[PDB]
Every structure is written in structure tokens, then in C-alpha cells.
Amino acid sequence: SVVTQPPSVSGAPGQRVTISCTGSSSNIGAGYDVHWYQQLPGTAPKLLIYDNNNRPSGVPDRFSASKSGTSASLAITGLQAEDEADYYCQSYDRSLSGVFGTGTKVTVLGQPKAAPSVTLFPPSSEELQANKATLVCLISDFYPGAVTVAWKAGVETTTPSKQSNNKYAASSYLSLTPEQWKSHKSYSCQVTHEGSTVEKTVAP
Amino acid sequence: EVQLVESGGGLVKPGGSLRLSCAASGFTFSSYSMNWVRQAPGKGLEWVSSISASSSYSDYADSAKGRFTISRDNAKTSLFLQMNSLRAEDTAIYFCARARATGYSSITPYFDIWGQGTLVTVSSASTKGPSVFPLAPSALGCLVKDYFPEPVTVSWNSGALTSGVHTFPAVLQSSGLYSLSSVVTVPSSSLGTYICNVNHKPSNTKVDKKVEPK
Amino acid sequence: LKESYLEESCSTITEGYLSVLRTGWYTNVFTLEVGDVENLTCADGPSLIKTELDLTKSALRELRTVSADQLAREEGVATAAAVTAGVAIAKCIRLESEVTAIKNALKKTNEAVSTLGCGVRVLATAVRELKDFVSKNLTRAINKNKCDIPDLKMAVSFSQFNRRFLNVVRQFSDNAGITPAISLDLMTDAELARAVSNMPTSAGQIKLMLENRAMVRRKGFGILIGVYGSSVIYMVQLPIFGVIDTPCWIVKAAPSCSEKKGNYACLLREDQGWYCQNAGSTVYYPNEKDCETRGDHVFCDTAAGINVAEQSKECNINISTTNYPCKVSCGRNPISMVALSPLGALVACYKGVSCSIGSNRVGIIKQLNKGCSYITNQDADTVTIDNTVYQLSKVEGEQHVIKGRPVSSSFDPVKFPEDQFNVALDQCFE
Ligand SMILES: *[C@@H]1O[C@H](CO)[C@@H](O)[C@H](O)[C@H]1NC(C)=O
Ligand SMILES: *[C@@H]1O[C@H](CO)[C@@H](O)[C@H](O)[C@H]1NC(C)=O
Ligand SMILES: *[C@@H]1O[C@H](CO)[C@@H](O)[C@H](O)[C@H]1NC(C)=O
């Protein structure tokens, strides 16, 4: 089947974190080896580990890995800020050939937790004149970069990006026909950061 | 220097065709198996196809079987991927990668050199200028609604407001068009002027809206 | 294939071969069950069953002794490397825990995958036909040590079921526990196909291996683990060809001599043999025995190679190049000989020998001139030097010549230096 990884892993600077790689009988269980890549945002993947546990020449010793049965794991012993990246495991499948794990984002928690500031903007009259209505819920200055925003259909949310001050920021857009904005008394976007919910509402 | 340089990426309509080319330099090209790996926007790595050093063996992922054909020319040290019947899900950055296999305990290929990749965009959409509507300070901003393709830059006050501003990432809609937002935080006492400078170089459009309270 | 005669150096290069280089080993462990034959006897006089029983009992007793000697001693560059690696795995399996693990995993089926305590992942195979015959048929039909029975079917079956065991004992006794190759008795063709399929390789490797089983049996070998009761445990190392499809070429050469009134000045390329590209390195095999050919495919062992600079290939275009010290052997003593190439033959005819090329239906085609001549396999079937007849191959391909005055024609035989062996072409002039 598909090789799965945890979507996210996080740790403090100097912490040891592990990334699992869950294969199956047709790949790792079939005797195939596991490789690992590190990908910084915007760049090509870089070889990090080959043949289960060997480091290429330019890879520091804090990276180590192993393989066991139908799974593998990558260890980073002593996270540093530069280790924040996406990590992919890789093997070969008897029927699917080259297979890549689903990938893991590693966050290095180098900052205190910060609650998000939410500013919900109502549809501009100019846009209603264009027979269009979009509500823009803007989330800002939060740490770490992971948030769930809610309103049902017509929802488009950007994955948390990183702004200045090294804090994170996200945005969500509810598209409605002009009639629908006049139909309801109020619309609201709820932002959840670290189990905490912030709700801003807008009324026509 | 060991280098791979992909080329041939661009926009294409569903059912269209493109041919990607990788220029290899700095190593003995004919000694190595070569691969194509792709990565959809915000998604994971996905192996596409491989070809052996002398083209005796080739392999493809189920998605590429029939539609895609890999090939190489060792004389020019170049790799090629012929893609036909392209669909929207083929939108990705396509990487060219040199493969290695130790062959001690198994034959499990790893990729030790990657090119920077070329973007392949499959869409029924055509180049479109952005429509800029203002976000009312009542936190001030301007929203770009439907533009194509992705490249779009948003400045504020001709770059004067460089501190206290974030341009968000774009969102693709069922329409196949893109929409961005740029926000600004200033003193709620400095209301009485900030201008939203936008540029869609693809369509050669430059919009300069100003933000004002309700 | 494409062969080029290099007239300047009396040599040939044949290109267009594709590598199949052994990089590793896949271990298939076997448990050949003989059964309790030592608790059976024939007190009847000469008999067919008695003959077979005594052969089986003795073969099993001899194996315990070849095993003891082997264990004592264990507690070609490629052959030496292969044995070292296999013996390391054999010491792992020889541990008591691993044997019983293997036997247990094989109690429910005749084939199982297992990972040893050493981390080596192996295939285990049960061969039970001999034990099953002995326990379910022979032990009972010999009620009271009576082996002269009139069944005849029993004797035939006993002979049929035990010959694989006898042949295995012979190979391990004749080779001190380490066979040179993989016989059909160590691994049948069905077992080889099963193991080849179970290997973690690519579908291409699997086809090349199943279409070249005889080559697989020559590259692999077997190691005796030991005799644990009535169970013979041995391992077979199957080759893993991790480098494949890279370009390879073979260089052949013959002595190129000029002559001035009985005095000779000779040149011989000392870089003959196989060359294969291997991951940014050119690998050189000076012994043509280290590589075997099957069509365009050349099978070699990565452990027997020598790394050479990629500029060494320029000795096949201009031996007098200044970009690489092409190795040659010079001297005043001509040697007449024939160097067979894949698509022809180099013939070096000097002093008082007679050289000719012949046809299998016409006979002598012509006499050859003195010096070096290149014969294609389409112009002749044979080359003869004096009474020695060399058969040319029938392989088809492109033939090419790189014309050029032989470098040895510039040497002055009159006062030519003594024999310089393995030197640069400039050192031969003076
Ligand atoms: C072994 O041989 C003895 C003596 O003939 C006999 O009594 C016994 O039943 C045999 N046991 C087995 C293993 O069948
Ligand atoms: C061996 O024993 C089995 C028991 O079912 C029997 O069917 C088979 O015919 C026997 N073989 C001989 C040689 O009698
Ligand atoms: C071979 O190399 C030598 C030295 O570089 C050069 O002078 C000559 O022209 C080249 N060609 C031949 C075939 O001699």
C-alpha cells in the first residue's frame, strides 16, 4: 500500500524527535531498504540518509535512522533551527516500484506560544456592485503555525504561512452570492489555536 | 560541478502535451539510472518514472502508464519526459534526479542529485488580470479576487509601509483562478493615506487602490 | 556490438556490451531432512535396500566429519571476498537459537522468510522428501531388519529419494564445505525460480536472472552450516546484480613489431581485458576469466575490479596521446600468436612461422603477410599458426578500422633498448 508518516512532529531546540515511516509487506517487509530526504521550503529535496542508516558526507551526526520489519524511523538528536523542514522516507515496492512516504513537517519550537489576533473584514460595497461577496477572516501573530478555522461550503483557507517577527499568519475566505449576505443576520469565523477558539462575527 | 537543470515546464490545457528536458553536467551521465519525481503544490513527493543507464529498462507509476514516456540521449547527456493526455492533477514541480543503488542487501534506489525542478501547470484557465477590492479599516488590507497565472506581487504605499504588512498565500478556486490578500497593521489614530500597490506581471497589470474607512 | 581494429597499436576495442555487475548476495538457507536412518539396519545379507541404506548412513556420517573439520578451520580475489562474507552469515546460522528458529518457522510450511539475529534477511526452504519416505514407508517395511523384500518399488523409491542427499554430501566433502557453484542438488530449478522471485530487486533483474540461471549458478555458491540430528542445514548465496545496463568494452591486443635485417622492435598493449562503467568510475578486469558474456550482457564481480581514470580510454584512439600514460611492453623479441576478439582475430606473424586464414568449406584462403593483420569472422572461419588452428566466432556486429601507421614502425630495431615491461610509450623510444 502507501507508506505513511505522521503529518507533523515538533520539539524544542536541543530535543530529540523521531519520525516514523510505516511500510508494508510489499516494500520494507519485502526486504527493501529505506532512504530519507530533507526538503527546505522552496528547494529540491536533499539526500539525508541512504541504506537505512548511512549519512552522506554533508549530513551532521545528529541525524540517525533505522529500519525494523515493516517500518523505519528517523531520529534528530538535538533539534536546531535549521532542521525545520519537510522529511520524506523512501523505499521500493514490489508492485508500485519507487514509493515515497507521505512526509512529515518538523517544527522547532524556538518561541513562546502566542494567541492569534483575528480581524474579520466584511464584503466591500465595491465587490457587491460586481455581484460578488467574499468574507475575509484574517488570522495573525500566532505561534506555532497550526490553526483550524470554521464558519460550511464556499470556504477556502490558506495553510499557515510565516510573517515577520517569526510569527505565523493564516487567512480564510467565505464566498457567498450578494443575496446570501443580506439573508443572514450575522456570519462568523472561529479560529482554534492550541485548543483555544477565537470568534469574530460580521453583520450586514 | 554535478548539476541537473530541468526545462520545458509551462501552462497546458487538460488533454494537452508537454516534453520536459533535463540537462545533466559534471558527471558520467551514461553510468547512471535516471528518474523523474514530481511534487504537487503543498503536497508530497511522488515518483513518476525511471530509465536505466542505456535505456534497456524503463518503469512508470500507475498514473503515468500509457500517457508518459521517459527517454534519454547519452550523447547530449539529457533526460526527457514526454507527457500526453495531461490532467489537472498533473500540476506539479517536476524534478530530475540521479539514482544510485548499493546492491548489497537489496536493490533499493536512492536519489543523490536533484535538479531544481520545472513547474508544469495543467488548467483550462487563461491569463487573467486581477480585480482588487479594498478591505475596510474599521488592520487595513486589499483583496485580489480572480487572476491567472499565480505570479502576483502586492506592495503598500509604494514600498514605504515595509514594516507591518503580510501578503498571504494564494487560493485556487473551483473557477481555476487565484485570489491573494495583503494586510497592514498601523495605529488606529494614523487613519487621517495608504495605497495598495499590486502587480500581475503575467497580464502586465498594475493596480494602485487606496484603503479608507467605511 | 561494434569492434574497431586499431592499426597503430595492433589492438581491437569491442563496444556495445551492457554490464551485469555482482554487488551483493541473497541468502537462501536449506534444511534437508534425511530422517532416522541410523536406527535402521539390514541383517539379511546383500540387498538393494541394504546397499541404499548403507550409502545413506555413510553419506550422513561423512557429512558430520566434513562439518567438524570445516568448523575447526572457520573458527581469486572475488572467490576470497565471497567466502569471507558467506562464512560470516554461516556463523550466525550456526548458533543454536537461529537453527531452532529456522526449524520452527519451517514446521508449518516448506518456505519462510526470516531475519537472523545478525540482521541478515534470509529465505528458508524445507526439503522433506527423504525423511518422509524413511518414516512413512521404509522404517515400517523393514519390520525386523528384513531388507531383502520382493517389493522392488521400495528399492527404486529409496534410490530415487536419496540421490539428492548423496550428491549434496559429495559436493561438500569434495570442496571441504564450500562448493564452487550451485548445483541442481543444492538448489533445484524450481527452488531457484522461487528464490529469484523472492529477492528484493527489480522485475528486470528477475528476468535477466531467470533467463541466465546457468550464469546465476556459476556466480553463486553454497556453504555447509552443519548436521543437526538427521537434518542437513546449508546455505546458498545467490548473486545480486546491483549495477546493470552500463556500457562495457573489451580490449584485445597482439605484438606489433617492426624489423630491420633480423633485428626486431616490438610493442604490446598491456591494458587488455574488460572495462565497465560503474558510477563515475571505470572498472578494469585484467583477467578475461573474471567476466563472462551472454549476448550483449557481460557479467562481472565488483570485488574483482580495478579503478582506472576515464582518460585511459583514449589509448584506444591515440596510444601516443599526451593526456594519459598508455601502458605498453617493448622489447627486441617478437612473439607470434593469435588474439581472438569477439568479432574477429588479431594475428601477429613474425620470424619463422607460417600464418594463414582458412574456410571450413574451401580450406586455405590466403597466406598472411608478416606483421600484424586483423581478420574479421566474416572473412574466415579459422586462423592457423604453424600447426595450431584457432576457430573464429560467429557473432555478428559492426566492424571498423582506425587506420594509422603502426607506432612500432617508428622504432629503430637496430640498437633497440632491452625489454621494458609495463612502461609508457615515451619510455620505449628512449
Ligand atoms: C529404533 O530402533 C529400535 C530397535 O530396533 C526400535 O525398537 C525402535 O522402535 C526404533 N525407534 C524408532 C525411532 O522408530
Ligand atoms: C509412502 O507412504 C504413503 C502413505 O500415504 C503412501 O501413500 C505411498 O504410496 C508410500 N510410498 C511407497 C513407496 O509405498
Ligand atoms: C596523437 O597524440 C600526439 C601527441 O598529442 C599528437 O602529436 C598526434 O598528432 C596524435 N595523433 C596521432 C594519431 O598520432
Author numbering:
A (entry chain C): 2 to 9, 11 to 27, 27A, 27B, 27C, 28 to 95, 95A, 96 to 106, ...
B (entry chain B): 1 to 52, 52A, 53 to 82, 82A, 82B, 82C, 83 to 100, 100A, ...
C (entry chain F): 19 to 93, 111 to 465
Quote what the paper states about this structure:
The human metapneumovirus (hMPV) fusion (F) protein is essential for viral entry and is a key target of neutralizing antibodies and vaccine development. As a class I viral fusion glycoprotein, hMPV F is first translated as a single polypeptide precursor (F0). Proteolytic cleavage converts F0 into disulfide-linked F2 and F1 subunits. Three F2/F1 heterodimers then associate into a metastable prefusion trimer that constitutes the active form of the protein.
All three variants (T365C/V463C/T127C/N153C, T365C/V463C/V231I, T365C/V463C/L219K) exhibited further 1.2-, 1.9-, and 1.2-fold increases in protein expression relative to the parental construct containing T365C/V463C, and the Tm of the variant containing two disulfide bonds increased 6.4 °C relative to the base construct. We named this variant DSx2 and further added either L219K or V231I to it. We determined a crystal structure of DSx2 complexed with antibody MPE8 to determine the effect of multiple substitutions on the conformation of hMPV F. The protein complex crystallized in space group P2 and a dataset was collected to a resolution of 2.2 Å. The asymmetric unit consists of one F protomer and one Fab. Surprisingly, the protein complex crystallized as a monomer and there was no crystallographic symmetry to complete the trimer. There is unambiguous electron density for the introduced disulfide bonds locking the β3/β4 hairpin of site V to α2 (Cys127/Cys153) and α10 within HRB to β14 (Cys365/Cys463). L-CDR1 and L-CDR3 contact Ser232, Met234, and Thr236 in a helix-loop-helix region at antigenic site II via polar interactions. Additionally, the H-CDR3 loop inserts into a pocket circumscribed by antigenic sites II and V, and contacts Thr41, Trp43 and Pro235. H-CDR1 interacts with a β-hairpin formed by β9 and β10 at antigenic site III, and residues from H-CDR2 interact with Asp280. Given that our complex structure was crystallized as a monomer, we were not able to observe the interaction of MPE8 with a neighboring F protomer as shown in the MPE8-bound RSV F structure.
